[PDB]
Symmetry: C2
Subunit: 251 residues, 2 copies
């Protein structure tokens, strides 16, 4: 049966519980904080579990649990690699570059000085985001585990259009929204979103895009997509699609 | 040519520089802290670079740089996956378990309370190590527990009795090239060599130092290091560890 791993129940999780019940999809709720994860011995909580949906609000907890499930041989939706490829901006930007996908000009500095040189080279205004808006050099200076002293820098992008969030399930873009309003999926947006999903390892993710002057650019990819408002907005059963995908990977 | 990526020059790095020079292996030193890493545009510092040896003391810097090199299509010794599979104890223990390799009983808690339950279940004494970079009783446990993807994680291991000394094996590719006791030279045996190479393979392969426990239950893999230190081991083992590392890297050149 399906195991829905969680720590804090949000409306997203409740919708998952309700859809599973309505779909007749055998499942059980697994409270991760109290789950004993001893290598070599499957917990009683996981007895009968053939596939798991990793829904923890905490990234550290979710990734640690996804890693554990792989050690037990239980397929987990959004494998460890996808979760970390997504929750780490440098990792995600690197994955997009290797897949040759469009994104804002991006760079990474490993010390304060190089960060300044890069921002200066990029020309202001520039963007500085945590790996896991600078107006001028003055603002830059003022602002200034494997994440010790890293500075993720991106060019500031002009947006002729609204940002788009695309919900990708497997090889299909199933819904999209503007940033909220429904964004009727087009061939262009759908194909780019699925390729972005593939770039980070595949699975169930929300791809955030920028409709810039240079065209569609991939901004970020989320490994544990939130969709409570999007169901009504898009009219698409996102929770049900997610559950069916996970259930299909069952072993 | 080979690019040796570094931040702080330790004797290990100097030996690498000297062996490369003596071997006639075309290379250049690349100071990572000042390297501009912009995706889509290879830095001038990397002009002509066909393979890189990731030697930064800082793990965060080394992993970020290894990732960058993969984006540039430049092979890097100890790919990002290996560096992170190694610098993260839970990741490394999980990789060892999937490869079916022996190691101390290991567990991970994601909150203070579960950590206590586990330690209690393991029975004291138990070991508590930081996930990245001995509990006597419940009281000690509570005290210790109170004192990015690593927020609130508690790596717990059983306390192991060691009838023998700990062994550090230097693995280069599919070969265990040297080993030391913990320092004295540890003449490599079939058993130790095979386990060490399998442990290296389990985390993704490359150049790593495998630390083993000679316990009552036999050989157990304790940890795997992605940027092995070897300044003292060269003299201790009599093996040219730096040279072996460089030749392995150079062979992956593209």
């Amino acid at each position: 049966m399906l195991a829905i791993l969680y720590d804090r129940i949000r409306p997203d999780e409740r919708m998952l519980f309700e859809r599973a019940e309505a779909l007749g999809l055998p499942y059980k709720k697994v409270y991760v904080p109290a789950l004993p994860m001893v290598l070599g011995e499957r917990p009683k909580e996981l007895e009968g579990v053939t596939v798991a949906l990793e829904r923890c609000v905490s990234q550290s907890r979710g990734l640690a649990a996804a890693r554990y499930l792989t050690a037990l041989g239980i397929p987990v939706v959004n494998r460890p690699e996808v979760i970390e490829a997504c929750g780490d901006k440098w990792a995600t930007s690197v994955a997009l570059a290797k897949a040759g996908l469009p994104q804002p000009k991006t760079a990474l500095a490993t010390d304060r000085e190089e960060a300044l040189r890069l921002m200066e080279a990029f020309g202001y205004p520039v963007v500085l985001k945590p790996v896991i808006x600078x107006x001028x050099x003055x603002x830059x200076x003022x602002x200034x585990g494997f994440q010790h002293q890293l500075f993720y820098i991106q060019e500031y992008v002009e947006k002729p259009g609204r940002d788009i969030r695309v919900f990708v399930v497997g090889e299909r873009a199933i819904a999209a929204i503007y940033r909220a309003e429904n964004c009727p999926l087009t061939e262009e947006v759908a194909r780019l979103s699925v390729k972005a999903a593939e770039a980070v390892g595949g699975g169930v993710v929300a791809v955030d895009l920028f409709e810039s002057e240079r065209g569609l650019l991939v901004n970020e990819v989320n490994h544990t997509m939130e969709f409570k408002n999007s169901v009504h907005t898009t009219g698409v059963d996102i929770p049900g699609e997610i559950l069916k995908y996970a259930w299909s990977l069952a072993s």
